[PDB]
Design a protein around this ligand. Structure first.
Ligand SMILES: *[C@H]1C[C@](C)(N)C(O)(O)[C@H](C)O1
Ligand SMILES: *[C@H]1C[C@](C)(N)C(O)(O)[C@H](C)O1
Lengths: 7, 4, 7, 5
């Protein structure tokens, strides 16, 4: 991944 | 709890 | 805050 | 930490 969030 |  | 990221 | 939060 590498992005973050939170969804 | 989502993501990553 | 309260959301996440990362930007 | 803290580019978001
Ligand atoms: C990450 C933070 C958030 C966006 N406030 C959430 O609690 O809704 C999500 C489930 O996790
Ligand atoms: C959080 C993770 C990321 C999106 N890969 C980033 O490194 O670009 C950002 C600055 O921090």
């Amino acid at each position: 991944x590498x992005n973050x969030x939170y969804x | 709890x989502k993501x990553x």
